[PDB]
């Protein structure tokens, strides 16, 4: 029993983390095979970050301008090129700790694990979600860019995020491993705002099934609802619309607990209209929306890697 | 910016995890140098778990009764002995991935990272605290015993917990790496209850300083208090007493934000007497008590390993 914000084991990703220095600027890099991936603003100076033209900045640099360090060993850069917002630095040595990996781009509402790094060294690991406004509520300080978000399936590490910047509100923005930003954010130190965020409804229901699995049933009621009457209340409380595919995804958790999805939606309707009244669900006073249905099945069935 | 439940990188601990089978029972083992550590109830059968005498059960077994698997390789057991509630299985091969490690026992209110494992394979990593009643609120299923809790300092892994059992309330109990249980719990499948838990006050204040560091200041007030008047309110709300040493530990966070500890205690007093009134602190509606002062300094200063 028990339910926690559980992140994937970070060992496979730790072996791919390096430090990339260019001038007075340094950050973290992802070293897979003979290529090192890092955010492109490493070629920026402090005065060249308000309105930078990375095409001009990059051709102004050579291979010897990139200090790549893997622990004590300094990796020799033999090639460099830009792929959207990331830098691909070809090195003369293939990473011997390279796992089976993938470069995927995730959808809002999906989760992943972050390995926050500084100077190429891992500092911590936590779980994150891709918010509907394409931001992430992470924990990042100066020098954390180049940290990656990832999922793990069997032996394969699915890289899905690389850290870049922090928005004025404190939330963070980044790209996939091909360098394409999540959301309408550019890598300039300029005034930028994210779209208004909403609650990931299908994740809240999955988290509610996790509570039922662990003995938390005080929010359950005999009432049911239709998908249309529930969505009319979800829109009023800034929740994402529930689709039939969502009801199908929650199928396994629905059958495992014997609670229909539309029945669980009636409990969510009551929780949204009445609050919790001093109660807690899985040790939380807020409805958690950063657990996918797979996340619940993973935690409550003990899937390993 | 940002504040998350951040766990240590699990790579160093992943390389020490093995699977220990004895009869029809299997669980996880910790392999350091030429010794494998695992909970002692692996030598138990399903019918021998209500009132087991482990001294009798162990002398009834030989070295060949212990199946130790490290990945595909089956480790040859050449010695076995009991140390309180753990089993020490001497093997003919030293773990080449053995890091600099330590066996420490932590105090209630201290935190650590858990690497939940099954069949010797890591499944996830999350952060935990040693509750004042010596329980932990973890996420464990059948077959998770032998998973370890740990902290990391520089290069040294400080092992501080090994998982054993789940109490009827859903909380979990275990031992240090010398086999001595945390709290008044024994490894029998019997009716057992933990002492009433209290809130770790010094952790709540440290978490409040983390909120001030990240721009959350709505709970701050101009009022102050004395250590005695605050503790009189803390006792009414089932909080641990604040000591002068606690005020000294919170020193760094106090000076970094310019908020005296006793001034921050006045904000906690108001939050306890009035609630939050629909507000949130660091994305939470409850006062978090699973962040030590070191945890806050670690997250907000970017300490790596």
């Amino acid at each position: 029993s028990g339910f926690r914000k559980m992140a994937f084991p970070s060992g496979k990703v730790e072996g791919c983390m390096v430090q990339v220095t260019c001038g007075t600027t340094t950050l973290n890099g992802l070293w897979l095979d003979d290529v090192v991936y890092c955010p492109r603003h490493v070629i920026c100076t402090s005065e060249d970050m308000l309105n930078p033209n990375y095409e001009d900045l990059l051709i102004r640099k050579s291979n010897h301008n990139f200090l790549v360090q893997a622990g004590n060993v300094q990796l020799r850069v033999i090639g460099h090129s830009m792929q959207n917002c990331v830098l691909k630095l070809k090195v003369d040595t293939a990473n011997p700790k390279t796992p089976k990996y993938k470069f995927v781009r995730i959808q809002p509402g999906q989760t992943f694990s972050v390995l926050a790094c500084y100077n190429g060294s891992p500092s911590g690991v936590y779980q994150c979600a891709m918010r509907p406004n394409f931001t992430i509520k992470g924990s990042f300080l100066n020098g954390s860019a180049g940290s990656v978000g990832f999922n793990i399936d069997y032996d394969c590490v699915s890289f899905c995020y690389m850290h870049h910047m922090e928005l004025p509100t404190g939330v963070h923005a980044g790209t996939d491993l091909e360098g394409n930003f999540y959301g309408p954010f550019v890598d300039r130190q300029t005034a930028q705002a994210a779209g208004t965020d909403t609650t990931i409804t299908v994740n809240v229901l999955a988290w509610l099934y996790a509570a039922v699995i662990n003995g938390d049933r005080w929010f359950l009621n005999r009432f049911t609802t239709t998908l249309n009457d529930f969505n009319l209340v979800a829109m009023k409380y800034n929740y994402e619309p529930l689709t039939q595919d969502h009801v199908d995804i929650l199928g396994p958790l629905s059958a495992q607990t014997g609670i229909a999805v539309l029945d669980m939606c009636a409990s969510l309707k009551e929780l949204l209209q009445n609050g919790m009244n001093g109660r807690t669900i899985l040790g939380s006073a807020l409805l958690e929306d950063e657990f996918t249905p797979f996340d619940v099945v993973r935690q409550c069935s003990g899937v390993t890697f | 910016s940002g504040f998350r439940k951040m766990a240590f990188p699990s790579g160093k601990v992943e390389g020490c995890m093995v699977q220990v089978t004895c009869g029809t029972t299997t669980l996880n083992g910790l392999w350091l140098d030429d010794v494998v550590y695992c909970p002692r109830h692996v030598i138990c059968t399903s019918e021998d778990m209500l009132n087991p005498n482990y001294e009798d059960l162990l002398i009834r077994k030989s070295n060949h009764n212990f199946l130790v698997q490290a990945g595909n390789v089956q480790l040859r057991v050449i010695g076995h002995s009991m140390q309180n509630c753990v089993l020490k299985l001497k093997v003919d091969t030293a773990n080449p991935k053995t890091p600099k490690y330590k066996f420490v026992r932590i105090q209630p209110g201290q935190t650590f990272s858990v690497l939940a494992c099954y069949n010797g394979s890591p499944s996830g990593v999350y952060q935990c605290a040693m509750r004042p009643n010596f329980t932990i609120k973890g996420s464990f299923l059948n077959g998770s015993a032998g998973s370890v809790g740990f902290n990391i300092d520089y290069d040294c892994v400080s092992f501080c917990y090994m998982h054993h059992m789940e109490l009827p309330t859903g909380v979990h109990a275990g031992t240090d790496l010398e086999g001595n249980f945390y709290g008044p719990f024994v490894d029998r499948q019997t009716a057992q209850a933990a002492g009433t838990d209290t809130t770790i006050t010094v952790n709540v204040l440290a978490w409040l300083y983390a909120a001030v560091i990240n721009g959350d200041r709505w709970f701050l007030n101009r009022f102050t208090t004395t250590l005695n008047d605050f503790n009189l309110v803390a006792m009414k709300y089932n909080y641990e007493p604040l000591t002068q040493d606690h005020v000294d530990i919170l020193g760094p966070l106090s000076a970094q934000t310019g908020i005296a500890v006793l001034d921050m205690c006045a904000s906690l007093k108001e939050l306890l007497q009035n609630g939050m009134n629909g507000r949130t602190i660091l994305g939470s509606a409850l006062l978090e008590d699973e962040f030590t002062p070191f945890d806050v300094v670690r997250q907000c200063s970017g300490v790596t390993f």
Partner: peptide, 10 residues
């Protein structure tokens, strides 16, 4: 109140 590119040290 502008964004921050999070490189350099720490």
């Amino acid at each position: 109140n502008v964004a921050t590119l999070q490189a350099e040290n720490v």
